[PDB]
Ligand binder design. Structure first.
Ligand code: FMN
Ligand code: SF4
Ligand code: FES
Lengths: 87, 213, 430
């Protein structure tokens, strides 16, 4: 339920091939950016960093939970379906 | 003592249960005490009625209550396991319930529980092989000034001594149904050795009524 | 006044407390019940709430809220939902058996109280919730209610006032927690007896989600008399803010355990000696008293010498009036075991809904069981004190508080006894 990992903007790159090492079965790669993840305060900072480095990019808008209407009393409604059958 | 059900040949969904036609008439009266649209309020009395007819509640009896009142079986299962008066396994003809909370303990409810076990030969929580008695300890029964006391089925037997509760059990074996109430000499909760109050004849209608009425 | 007690029979309300007169309607009417009830109903809810407020009456169920103000929460315009009075006859507090006598010996006082009380709140019906073990008392009450219906005292045109009122008896199924007011409502609705959080408050969202007031049997049963004899008459008994008479249960180690009606603010020592026949073995054989049922902390003999039995005085003694269930323990009692058995009671009665009481009361029970044997270290006493303070004030309902207070009373007043038992166990097992 924690939301502290949804504060900052992240930049990551497209995933590329990983294959099994013949000797051990370990996961091998030839992608130097496979682990590179950058952190930004705003999408504007992220976009500015991407542009000056020549990277084509996709921006995804921030998803925020919409405000909910919560009422403990609706659990016991006289005539509404919100009446709970157990606690 | 478990709160999970396992099917057995004697307790499973195909165990036979059904309300008698007379008991169905009582259910209507029960269901009509609550507002229309809130029939689930009748689960406790209807479930208790099933136990009064059958002596206890097999899972089939719980399913029937859920079916009649149109509530999920789980909600009936929750009620049956929450309240301690519902017997989810068979009990004996006479369910002996000894109170052992502190006020009764202070007045030697231990000697009562000991006497019953010695007479019946069983331990707490057990049923006799003849299946006439089941013995359990219970919390305060609301008769503390009449301690030590027991409840057998629907009746309170009060102010007990080891002699008193052995006569009560002997009467139950003999088939006689003993009278409930204190066995010490007083009739209810009045102090022993004579009333310290309410000795004068009571005032009649209108006594002390204020002006204006 | 300076001295309270020696209540006279004329001033007793529950005049058939011992069942030595007829409890059925004819007896009740000849004792002054159901008298000028129509006149009271036609004075209106505001007048009734006036007399209850003036009387200084406070809830007799244990919490002791001022009844007049509490009942006035329902005196508001209707919004469409029906309004209900729920009468609490669960009577679960150990040492408390006062409501049992009203139901079976003075049932018509309760029925009239429901009608008069229900009128003040604009209620359409009263649901009397009686604990399932009180089967014979419930049947007595049911017979009394039939008589009132047959006489036209309740139901359509109750007493001829033009007010329609119903009285229903619903039985419990064995659960001390169902005496808590919101857990009582949840039980009537057919769920597990688990208390609700507040808000909403029952006067806004109650039984079936409708405006409701939960009132104790004794509180409701005295309302007809207060309206007849006046609030000024009731307020003339007891100390200020502690008015009226009160039913007392005296059990434990007394010569004559009994239920008696006595003035509020009566000295505790006088009550035990005048009515209960004195402490077994003499007043000097006293060890401790639980003054208001198992939930109230115990007080030792020294405090009992002068403490008065009313709400304010017992709060000064670091306990509470509670239900006025006096449980007496003499010097032969194993005090640690006695309190341990009460924690075992709360462990068996916790509804399990909320963490501090589900886990904490069970935790306190295991510690107390070791304290009885002395199988502990003194550092665990302050641990137990801190555990109890983590339960109190952090639970949904007051059962958690009721489990922590008896523990605190033991530690507060009998810490040396706990330490002696621990010291002795170590020697035998060193
Ligand atoms: C665990 C628990 C058990 C209770 N049992 C009862 C009871 O048996 N009878 C009662 O009147 N109040 C009982 N109460 C108190 C009620 O919640 C409530 O305060 C009372 O019914 C209010 O009525 P009154 O203002 O007339 O006292 C209990 C409270 C708790 C927390
Ligand atoms: S304090 Fe105990 S009885 Fe009260 S709601 Fe929490 S778990 Fe249930
Ligand atoms: S302690 Fe046994 S009836 Fe109350």
């Amino acid at each position: 339920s924690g939301v502290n990992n949804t504060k900052k903007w992240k930049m990551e790159f497209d995933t590329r091939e990983r294959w099994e090492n013949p000797l051990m079965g370990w996961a091998s790669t030839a992608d130097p950016l496979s682990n590179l993840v950058l952190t930004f305060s705003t999408k504007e900072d992220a976009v500015a960093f991407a542009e000056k480095n020549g990277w084509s990019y996709d921006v995804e808008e921030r998803k925020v939970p919409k405000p909910k209407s919560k009422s403990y009393g609706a659990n016991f409604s006289w005539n509404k379906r919100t009446r709970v059958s157990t606690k | 003592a478990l709160f999970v059900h396992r099917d057995t040949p004697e307790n499973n969904p195909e165990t036979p249960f059904d309300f008698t036609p007379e008991n169905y008439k009582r259910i209507e009266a029960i269901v009509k005490n609550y507002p229309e649209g809130h029939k689930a309020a009748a689960v406790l009395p209807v479930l208790d009625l099933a136990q009064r007819q059958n002596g206890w509640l097999p899972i089939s009896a719980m399913n029937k209550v859920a079916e009649i009142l149109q509530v999920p079986p789980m909600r009936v299962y929750e009620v049956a396991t929450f309240y301690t008066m519902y017997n989810r396994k068979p009990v004996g003809k006479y369910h002996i319930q000894v109170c052992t909370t502190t006020p009764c303990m202070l007045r030697n409810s231990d000697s009562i529980l000991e006497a019953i076990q010695k007479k019946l030969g069983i331990k707490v929580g057990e049923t006799t092989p003849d299946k006439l008695f089941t013995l359990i300890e219970v919390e305060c029964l609301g008769a503390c000034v009449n301690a030590p006391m027991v409840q057998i089925n629907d009746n309170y037997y009060e102010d007990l001594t080891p002699k008193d509760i052995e006569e009560i059990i002997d009467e139950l074996k003999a088939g006689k149904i003993p009278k409930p109430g204190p066995r010490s000499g007083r009739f209810s909760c009045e102090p022993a050795g004579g009333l310290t109050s309410l000795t004068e004849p009571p005032k009649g209608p209108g006594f002390g009524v204020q002006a204006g009425l | 006044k300076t001295s309270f007690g020696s209540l006279k029979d004329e001033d007793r309300i529950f005049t058939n407390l011992y069942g030595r007169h007829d409890w059925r309607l004819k007896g009740a009417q000849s004792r002054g019940d159901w008298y000028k009830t129509k006149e009271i109903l036609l004075k209106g809810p505001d007048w009734i709430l006036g007399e209850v407020k003036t009387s200084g009456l406070r809830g007799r169920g244990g919490a002791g809220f001022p009844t007049g103000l509490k009942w006035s929460f329902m005196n508001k315009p209707s919004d469409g939902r029906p309004k209900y009075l729920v009468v609490n006859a669960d009577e679960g507090e150990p040492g408390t058996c006062k409501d049992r006598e009203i139901i079976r010996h003075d049932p018509h006082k309760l029925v009239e109280g429901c009608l008069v009380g229900g009128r003040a709140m604009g209620a359409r019906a009263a649901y009397i919730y009686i604990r399932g073990e009180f089967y014979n008392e419930a049947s007595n009450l049911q017979v009394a209610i039939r008589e009132a219906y047959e006489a036209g005292l309740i139901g359509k045109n109750a007493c001829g006032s033009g007010y329609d009122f119903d009285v229903f008896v619903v039985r419990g199924a064995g659960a001390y927690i169902c005496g808590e007011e919101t857990a009582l409502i949840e039980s009537i609705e057919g769920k597990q007896g688990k208390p609700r959080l507040k808000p909403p408050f029952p006067a806004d969202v109650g039984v079936f989600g409708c405006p409701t007031t939960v009132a104790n049997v004794e509180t409701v049963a005295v309302s007809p008399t207060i309206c007849r004899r006046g609030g000024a008459w009731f307020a003339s008994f007891g100390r200020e803010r502690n008015s009226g008479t009160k039913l007392f249960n005296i059990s434990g180690h007394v010569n004559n355990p009994c239920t008696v009606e006595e003035e509020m603010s009566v000295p505790l020592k006088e009550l035990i000696e005048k009515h209960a026949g004195g402490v077994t073995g003499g007043w000097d054989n006293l060890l401790a008293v639980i003054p208001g049922g198992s939930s109230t902390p115990l007080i030792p003999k020294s405090v009992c010498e002068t403490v008065l039995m009313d709400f304010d005085a017992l709060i000064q003694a670091q306990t509470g009036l509670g239900t006025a269930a006096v449980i007496v323990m003499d010097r032969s009692t194993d005090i640690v075991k006695a309190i341990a058995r009460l924690i075992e009671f709360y462990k068996h009665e916790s509804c399990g809904q909320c963490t501090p009481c589900r886990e904490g009361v069970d935790w306190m029970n295991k510690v107390m069981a070791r304290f009885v044997r002395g199988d502990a270290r003194p550092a665990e006493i302050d641990s137990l004190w801190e555990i109890s303070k983590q339960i109190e004030g952090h639970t949904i309902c007051a059962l958690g508080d009721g489990a922590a207070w008896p523990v605190q009373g033991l530690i507060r007043h009998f810490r040396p006894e706990l330490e002696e038992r621990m010291q002795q166990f170590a020697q035998q097992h060193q």
